[PDB]
Design a protein around this motif. Structure first.
Motif, mmCIF file in Angstrom:
data_model
loop_
_atom_site.group_PDB
_atom_site.id
_atom_site.type_symbol
_atom_site.label_atom_id
_atom_site.label_comp_id
_atom_site.label_asym_id
_atom_site.label_seq_id
_atom_site.Cartn_x
_atom_site.Cartn_y
_atom_site.Cartn_z
ATOM 1 N N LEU B 60 34.877 50.137 36.996
ATOM 2 C CA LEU B 60 36.196 49.682 37.423
ATOM 3 C C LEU B 60 36.456 50.228 38.834
ATOM 4 O O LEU B 60 36.164 51.389 39.141
ATOM 5 C CB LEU B 60 37.259 50.195 36.441
ATOM 6 C CG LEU B 60 37.052 49.913 34.947
ATOM 7 C CD1 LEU B 60 37.823 50.896 34.144
ATOM 8 C CD2 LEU B 60 37.473 48.491 34.607
ATOM 9 N N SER B 72 47.195 49.240 37.878
ATOM 10 C CA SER B 72 46.241 48.411 37.145
ATOM 11 C C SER B 72 45.315 49.230 36.252
ATOM 12 O O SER B 72 44.863 48.750 35.215
ATOM 13 C CB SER B 72 45.383 47.619 38.129
ATOM 14 O OG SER B 72 46.177 46.931 39.086
ATOM 15 N N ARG B 76 42.988 48.026 32.788
ATOM 16 C CA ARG B 76 41.596 47.723 33.099
ATOM 17 C C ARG B 76 40.701 48.562 32.205
ATOM 18 O O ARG B 76 39.753 48.053 31.590
ATOM 19 C CB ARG B 76 41.319 47.969 34.584
ATOM 20 C CG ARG B 76 42.123 47.023 35.493
ATOM 21 C CD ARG B 76 41.548 46.883 36.901
ATOM 22 N NE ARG B 76 42.108 47.831 37.859
ATOM 23 C CZ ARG B 76 41.604 49.039 38.095
ATOM 24 N NH1 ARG B 76 40.524 49.455 37.441
ATOM 25 N NH2 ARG B 76 42.171 49.829 39.000
#
Ligand SMILES: NC(=O)c1c[n+]([C@@H]2O[C@H](COP(=O)([O-])OP(=O)(O)OC[C@H]3O[C@@H](n4cnc5c(N)ncnc54)[C@H](O)[C@@H]3O)[C@@H](O)[C@H]2O)ccc1C(=O)c1ccncc1
Ligand SMILES: NC(=O)c1c[n+]([C@@H]2O[C@H](COP(=O)([O-])OP(=O)(O)OC[C@H]3O[C@@H](n4cnc5c(N)ncnc54)[C@H](O)[C@@H]3O)[C@@H](O)[C@H]2O)ccc1C(=O)c1ccncc1
Ligand SMILES: NC(=O)c1c[n+]([C@@H]2O[C@H](COP(=O)([O-])OP(=O)(O)OC[C@H]3O[C@@H](n4cnc5c(N)ncnc54)[C@H](O)[C@@H]3O)[C@@H](O)[C@H]2O)ccc1C(=O)c1ccncc1
Ligand SMILES: NC(=O)c1c[n+]([C@@H]2O[C@H](COP(=O)([O-])OP(=O)(O)OC[C@H]3O[C@@H](n4cnc5c(N)ncnc54)[C@H](O)[C@@H]3O)[C@@H](O)[C@H]2O)ccc1C(=O)c1ccncc1
Lengths: 268, 268, 268, 268
Positions: B60, B72, B76
């Protein structure tokens, strides 16, 4: 199977099923370690207590103040675990301080004789034990002592505190000698635990004013500790000792690991 | 199987097969942990590097300075490890400091803008990461940051040192917030390691006088360390990080474990 | 006239014109303080040495290990400075450790008897002195002890170090008792000084390997100290002791002031 | 006449007759020192406040964040005290942190921009000031900064704490640069004081929960401090600053003197 698997540890300091070494010893055996135990004067007494551990283990008599024992130590351990087998861990969960040096008498009233007998069993004894066992330990081995934060003066523990400050320092000079043998020397600083001896004082044995201070000492511990603190569960500290005999902290020596919930890093 | 078995760790800071996180990540996977990785700008680059780890793990993108990422982040990670599965460990093996704030420019010449960009990525970022991931972590979880002893002023590290002193302090205030969730927040202070970035400086990149100081810094490390010190083996520090995500140090938070051979406890 | 003006100090530990107390005593008298001195066994000897100080001052015999002295102390001091006059300062520039506990014998070879006699004169003695003199001290008074940084293990000082770690801790429990009387209890941690006793060891008296280590100890001091370090000038440390008996550090107790050029805050 | 006699000090940070610098400045002038003062934005305001000091002293405008000022500084001071006269002391009794970084917002909610503006004025500014004034200071001179113990996490001070941990570290790297010039760089860590700004928060300005914590913070201070603690008397800390600009602590640099009654050495 796991962690302490296939290692040989010598746990000392047991004298009741409440004793913080007893809990180390249990967790150790729980991790697959062949143990060896140490006793003082009430032998038949601890023999019974130890007979309760997950598995059988020997019991060698060791009065830390007695020369003969410290000389006899290295061999007695060998016959026990088998000659040609070396010691992987040494726990020094031992300490002592007379009523006077603790909370019954104020700081200034404890005579050196008592203050001595104290520092001998809690400070110096770590060193004399490192000596008597160092020769028979496997490299990558580990020596560990039970301690408490003495950086700040606190009521009731009076001299037993100084004893621990000396202890913290002795650890550093033991970290040197052990280093050559590739052995690590560490200290796990624990929060308070209701052991038989601790419970007795909180019950006003060694003075009412002392028991109240120790009462208010524990009370403030969970207040600071971000993860809380259970003064009646020795498992947490016992499992940190294991982490320190397991080869998972392989680059730390002459150190102090804190098993106190984080209280020592918090002000209020 | 053992230690990190069946846990979910998120290791950050990898950027080369030399990086101290890469070694953590490997030892972690070696212990049966499902990992998640983090990257910065050279993504395809670390994707290759990570593809070499014992087993497959996601990657990520996370620029610690970027708000969007920190917002985010929490999600994620969830899609990656499966929704309804919570994070067990968070390694913050990340840090940065420009040439000027390090050894090329003397202490007084580094402008706040640079000194800022530095403390943002090495000090504050630990906190912003604790925030963005705390909600999805399992109780008994663990957050850990890579650090070095800043108690004494030393040459060449100039500001990166202060950055670490701030970092050591931020850890303590993260130990509070995490505590409620029953999460531990710790720091492992390592000795020097020849990573790509470290090697480059010792090779006189950031000034010749700096490279010589860092040269004489490592030289003095093994001198003090009772168990010695291998500045080209990140395994020792990497295995201490594991000990700190494993539930074997369950009563220590807002702390610093020393992976330095014991050098910090020795004078000479 | 100035600083110590019109105060009554009791300086102990003089045994040569090189002794770090002698220099305190001189600077004190230089600041307008009425002094009182203490001796051990070579009395006529220090009587000569003291007769050289800027002005005349009495000499009371005080063997710190001897009970009778510690009991007799409080009164003997009174007759000297006049009854109805109270003591304003107490310097404890005293300490001892046998050859074995120092550098001749390695750490493990020093027997408790010696390790005891050591901690008695350097650690505990501070407390027994605080007791015997506390009753006759003026509020806003000051008790001060000579010490050295024991946080890190160093070669050659072996046990004398532990003695000092105990000393640092005893200071904190003396800071309590003195507090009620409104007295401050502090410690000034000094760098090395070529006193008669120190010079002798650097001259290979207590072993050649020890003298070389202490040789390399001083050598490294000026290297770290930002303001340098003169190990043959006791004035700097002597003038810090004065600052601590003068009422200019009125809110510091159970503390340690560093008279070492700053070496303890520098790594290399 | 005495202590600071015939020295030139530059005291900064005054903004009210309650400000801890104002009290330093007064005690300084009381000791025979020619002062120079520093201001921020409310100039005419502090001009009035300063006009109340024992004797007249100039007022130079100095916004620590402003480059122009830091460049102009060295000269402006010279015209004031006369060219060819050098500065003997520099007090950095300055610091700032927005509401959010303090107690109104919890630790995780303070954005880097604010956390930045904070560390810039309280941490980094010490260094930028050491730079801008170092060239014109007399050897045997002294630079001193106001600080508070950040070793343990405490509620309400949140980030201002980290700011101070950075500050404590910057002091050590300033101790280096100053050393060459033979200047000492120190920090006096004070207990709480009811300044206008402090009083306002205890009065529930920055949140009610914060004011209560700071309320319970001071409350616990006198509890630990063996000599007590008056949080409404800045004289004690102000007189320690003097002891540190006077040439009586001549061998201490990169250090921290504690003006807190001894609270930091006591647990409870
Ligand atoms: N209270 C606690 O639970 C606690 C315990 N420890 C240390 O852990 C160690 C174990 O203590 P414990 O289990 O609580 O009590 P324990 O008394 O049950 O066990 C220790 C042993 O002392 C032994 N004994 C005395 N002299 C000798 C000798 N000469 N030879 C051989 N054995 C001897 C005795 O046989 C006993 O086995 C001690 O050194 C403690 O100080 C460390 C921290 C805490 C603590 O005391 C504390 C204090 C203040 N703030 C925070 C924590
Ligand atoms: N030299 C060492 O081996 C060493 C390393 N550490 C710390 O360990 C951490 C890992 O460093 P390393 O692996 O040596 O080097 P590394 O540079 O390979 O890894 C760290 C990361 O910084 C990351 N980066 C920069 N900004 C961002 C951002 N904004 N978002 C995401 N990623 C970013 C980058 O992507 C990289 O992955 C750092 O914080 C170190 O300071 C701790 C101690 C020692 C050390 O530096 C030291 C110094 C002085 N005395 C003793 C030891
Ligand atoms: N070497 C130094 O110059 C030094 C000295 N001190 C301390 O300063 C104190 C003064 O030592 P010094 O002046 O160097 O030496 P000193 O031996 O001349 O003076 C101390 C006294 O011990 C006295 N003595 C022994 N037993 C008794 C007793 N029972 N009753 C009364 N008097 C007794 C003796 O009479 C003598 O006056 C000691 O406690 C030192 O440890 C502190 C720091 C340093 C230091 O040792 C050091 C070590 C390692 N790293 C850095 C610094
Ligand atoms: N509360 C206290 O009394 C206290 C104060 N100090 C430090 O002492 C210093 C003086 O604070 P104080 O006098 O209480 O308050 P103050 O606000 O009156 O004085 C400081 C100055 O900040 C100045 N200012 C802001 N930005 C600028 C700038 N850019 N350029 C120039 N000036 C600027 C402002 O002009 C003012 O003069 C601060 O750095 C404090 O943190 C140290 C310790 C304690 C303390 O805060 C504390 C906290 C927690 N535990 C224990 C103690």
């Amino acid at each position: 199977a796991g962690l302490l698997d296939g290692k040989r540890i010598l746990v000392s300091g047991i004298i009741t099923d409440s004793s913080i070494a007893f809990h180390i010893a249990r967790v150790a055996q729980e991790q697959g370690a062949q143990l060896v135990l140490t006793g003082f004067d009430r032998l038949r007494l601890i023999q019974r207590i130890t007979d309760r551990l997950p598995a059988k283990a020997p019991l060698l008599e060791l009065d830390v103040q007695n020369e003969e024992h410290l000389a006899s130590l290295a061999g007695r351990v060998t016959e026990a675990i088998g000659a040609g087998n070396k010691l992987d861990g040494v726990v020094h969960s031992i300490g002592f301080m007379p009523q006077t040096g603790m909370g019954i008498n104020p700081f200034f009233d404890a005579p050196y004789a008592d203050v001595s007998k104290g520092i001998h069993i809690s400070a110096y004894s770590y060193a004399s034990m490192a000596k008597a066992l160092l020769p028979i330990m496997n490299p990558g081995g580990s020596i560990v002592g039970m301690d408490f934060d003495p950086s700040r003066a606190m009521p009731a523990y009076n001299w037993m505190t100084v004893a621990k400050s000396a202890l913290e320092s002795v650890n550093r000079f033991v970290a040197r000698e052990a280093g050559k043998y590739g052995v690590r020397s560490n200290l796990v600083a624990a929060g308070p635990i209701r052991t038989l001896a601790m419970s007795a004082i909180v019950g006003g044995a060694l003075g009412e004013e002392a028991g109240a201070q120790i009462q208010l000492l524990e009370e403030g511990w969970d207040q600071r500790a971000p993860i809380g603190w259970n003064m009646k569960d020795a498992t947490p500290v016992a499992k940190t000792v294991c982490a320190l005999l397991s080869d998972w902290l392989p680059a730390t020596t002459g150190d102090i690991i804190y098993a106190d919930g984080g209280a020592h890093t918090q002000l209020l």
